[PDB]
């Protein structure tokens, strides 16, 4: 009938790609790593514009958003219960199929318990076993302590939210429960402290917006976009909100009033926005400065 | 198509015709000098069966490996005389030439 869009829909990706932004100085910040002497090229104005164009293409790849997946369902499947083996071993065996050309989500990893039960390994055992035999750069078999609540607040205090997300992406699978819990705790610390600019021009901005829109908490991000003269993004945010909440007070108000452009933010501010007053004020200020520039 | 001979197709220059029905052919290959990283010619001798004794010293011949060697040192047969000594036919035009000059102009037969 009428399906609500997914994160990977072309309409949603285009909206979130623009709201993210592309800043080549931030996207290609100098990395603190082993250095080599730089190379130099003599370029015309045309050769320079082409090299800058190629950098933009390489940046749009580096800003490719990771897909937002729902939590994986625990694996509880018993393959066999050989009770004659009960009490013959004290420690359980983990068997991992290490055939090279198999996707890691198709690899049979089974566990023989001391009771004699042959069961499929749990999601946590699977990701641990895949790391043992197919070690991925940046991932640890034992969970790093940085992801403890006390240590994430340290990283948040330093405004290192992007490092937290880079570490979480490298350690956990996108559908893991630890992967989702860390991202959600990071998005919430950004909303509470108004640190939405820390994720602009990164592949993590869209996932953050997706979280706010689905949880009906876009008031903070919408104010930040207006204070920065990003009304195009602020208007797209209100439109993305209506697309994902079609049967809502704000979506109807826009239909009844045929609102467009800045008018959408006014409709949203009155009906559904929690900080409706602070938006009108923040929006009023913007229209004034725009009139001063016009005059 | 299978053969016990290692070198299946090789080009070389005939350097001897004193053996009956056998041409002695010098084959050169490029070999990389590991230290200098420069290629130098490395030459090897192959005996080739020439049933019709049509090979002349100095002509470039193409050798084909035999299924099995017919003699201690004869592992190849004459497959084609590429460049007859002093009687080269230009493959690009098909006309006879003497060095870098045509003996018959390509314009003769249009």
């Amino acid at each position: 009938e009428t399906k609500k869009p997914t994160f990977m829909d072309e309409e949603v990706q285009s909206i979130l790609t623009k709201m993210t932004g592309l800043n080549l100085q931030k996207t290609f910040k100098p990395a603190i790593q082993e250095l080599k002497p730089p190379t130099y090229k003599l370029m015309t104005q045309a050769q320079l514009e082409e090299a800058t164009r190629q950098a933009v293409e390489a940046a749009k790849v580096r800003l490719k958003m990771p897909p937002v997946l729902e939590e994986r369902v625990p694996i509880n499947d018993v393959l066999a219960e050989d009770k004659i083996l009960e009490g013959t071993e004290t420690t359980k065996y983990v068997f991992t199929d290490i055939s090279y050309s198999i996707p890691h989500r198709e690899r049979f990893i089974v566990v023989r318990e001391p009771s004699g039960t042959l069961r499929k390994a749990s999601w946590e055992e699977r990701d641990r076993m895949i790391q043992v035999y197919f070690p991925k750069e940046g991932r640890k078999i034992l969970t790093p302590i940085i992801f403890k609540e006390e240590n994430l607040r340290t990283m948040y205090s330093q405004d290192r939210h992007v490092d937290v997300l880079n570490l979480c992406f490298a350690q956990f699978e996108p559908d893991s429960t630890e992967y989702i819990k860390v991202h959600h705790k990071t998005y919430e610390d950004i909303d509470k402290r108004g640190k939405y600019d820390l994720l602009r021009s990164t592949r993590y901005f869209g996932g953050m917006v997706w979280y706010f829109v689905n949880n009906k908490k876009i008031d903070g991000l919408l104010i930040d976009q207006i204070q920065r003269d990003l009304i195009d993004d602020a208007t797209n945010l209100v439109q993305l909100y209506h697309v994902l909440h079609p049967d809502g007070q704000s979506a109807q108000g826009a239909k009844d009033q045929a609102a467009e452009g800045i008018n959408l933010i006014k409709v949203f501010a009155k009906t559904e926005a929690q900080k409706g007053a602070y938006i009108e004020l923040t929006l009023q200020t913007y229209q004034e400065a725009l009139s001063r520039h016009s005059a | 198509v299978r053969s016990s001979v290692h070198a299946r197709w090789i080009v070389g220059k005939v350097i001897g015709t004193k053996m009956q029905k056998t041409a002695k052919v010098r084959v050169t290959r490029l070999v990389l000098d590991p230290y200098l990283l420069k290629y130098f010619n490395k030459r090897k001798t192959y005996f080739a069966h020439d049933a019709l004794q049509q090979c002349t010293v100095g002509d470039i011949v193409l050798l084909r490996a035999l299924p099995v060697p017919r003699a201690k040192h004869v592992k190849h047969e004459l497959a084609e005389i590429v460049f007859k000594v002093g009687k080269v036919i230009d493959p690009v035009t098909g006309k006879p030439c003497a060095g870098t000059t045509y003996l018959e102009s390509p314009l003769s037969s249009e």
Partner: protein, 86 residues
């Protein structure tokens, strides 16, 4: 500096040197602009531009001179005659 006494030679050399100062261009005030390979008489000097943090990996005298110029990161190799004045 030349003199019969060592302390007088020190005075002459150092006081004269300030009247024969070179200006040395530095890339980002830490290294040279490009690799420099030259021969002076029989002394060969090959210098390489280096990134920050590389340090001065050069003949001890080149290290001393580079600190006076203000070069922080460079590699240099001295070949041929190793004469301090050359």
């Amino acid at each position: 500096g030349k003199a019969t006494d060592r302390m007088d030679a020190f005075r002459k050399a150092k006081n004269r040197a300030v009247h024969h100062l070179h200006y040395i261009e530095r890339y980002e005030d830490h290294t040279i602009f490009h690799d420099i390979s030259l021969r002076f008489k029989r002394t060969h000097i090959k210098m390489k531009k280096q990134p920050k943090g590389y340090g001065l990996r050069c003949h001890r005298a080149i290290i001393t001179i580079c600190r006076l110029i203000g070069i922080k990161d460079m590699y240099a190799k001295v070949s041929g005659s190793i004469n301090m004045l050359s």
